[PDB]
Amino acid sequence: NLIPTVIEERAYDIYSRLLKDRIIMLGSAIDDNVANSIVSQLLFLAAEDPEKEISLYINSPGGSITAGMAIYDTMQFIKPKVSTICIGMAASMGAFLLAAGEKGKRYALPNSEVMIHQPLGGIAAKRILLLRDKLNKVLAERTGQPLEVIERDTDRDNFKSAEEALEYGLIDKILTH
Amino acid sequence: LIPTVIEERAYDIYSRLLKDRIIMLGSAIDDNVANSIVSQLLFLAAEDPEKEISLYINSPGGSITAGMAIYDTMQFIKPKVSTICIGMAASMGAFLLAAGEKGKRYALPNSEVMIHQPLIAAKRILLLRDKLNKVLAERTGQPLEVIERDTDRDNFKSAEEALEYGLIDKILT
């Protein structure tokens, strides 16, 4: 098997258990099913208790821009703050959602990795440049980096450790102890 | 895997969103997907015919026949259907977005809207197409000829462009 069950009358799957305490998993490539699920989870958590914050644990290679932007817009819209924790791998759009978390609430584990390469290696050409420029814009805001260095590092295959990401401004802290 | 909530009542997600009258159209449209959300519309109209229904759209669209099934079930039911684009809205997804309750058609900042229609029993296709363009113009408020030009073309509209086109009414923040 893979996904165990936690019992308390109440039988949860482990991930539903984590969702009980406002933890959303992003442990897979981001397609539109994943996006719809994450959006619904965020909205429901934001309706249960608009004050207590929400945590998004990420271990994804980051698929689709449209899906990621759906999650991004949902994060912006809701009232609670979205804390974001890189578990093992935040690549492509997963890294984008990583840095999209609330400043002061963006974490990574010591041996996590971050790939900000948003890519479609060789489609309406103007739409593509529009989406690329938008990603770079908001990434520049979330990191504080210049738009030029993001423009350059977002287009090439880029690997980063937890410390490199913290230096870059993608995360705010590395979980310790 | 799909997560679940639990309030005696053990709800699945989506089911919990349907509990507050939210239907999720996040897949492509085929006969089964039509079958699935027309039943949700009918169930919500039978459970409460006055209160509105919300329809989140994240679909690349699909068959025209199935999308028209959904649209026609959206029109005759007593409650008014608000449509909210949350990511993508192409083919019948765009059309189902513009067909929402006038005033309660919504979109998200970086959501996109694509009005391109294709992507025996043939007399029925072009009649559906003419009805499609007719009601698209009657919902945006735009000339028919322009609508017909634009539905044969691949044109992506950002939330702002789709607001300035008449496909939506308000952006959410």
């Binding site: 909205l43 309706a47 949902t74 819209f77 | 507050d20 009258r21 939210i22 509105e52 919300s54 989140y56 608000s82 909210i84 949350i86 309660k104 919504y106 959410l172």
Partner: peptide, 6 residues
């Protein structure tokens, strides 16, 4: 997506 959808 309330307020207001629902």
């Amino acid at each position: 997506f309330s307020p207001x959808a629902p």
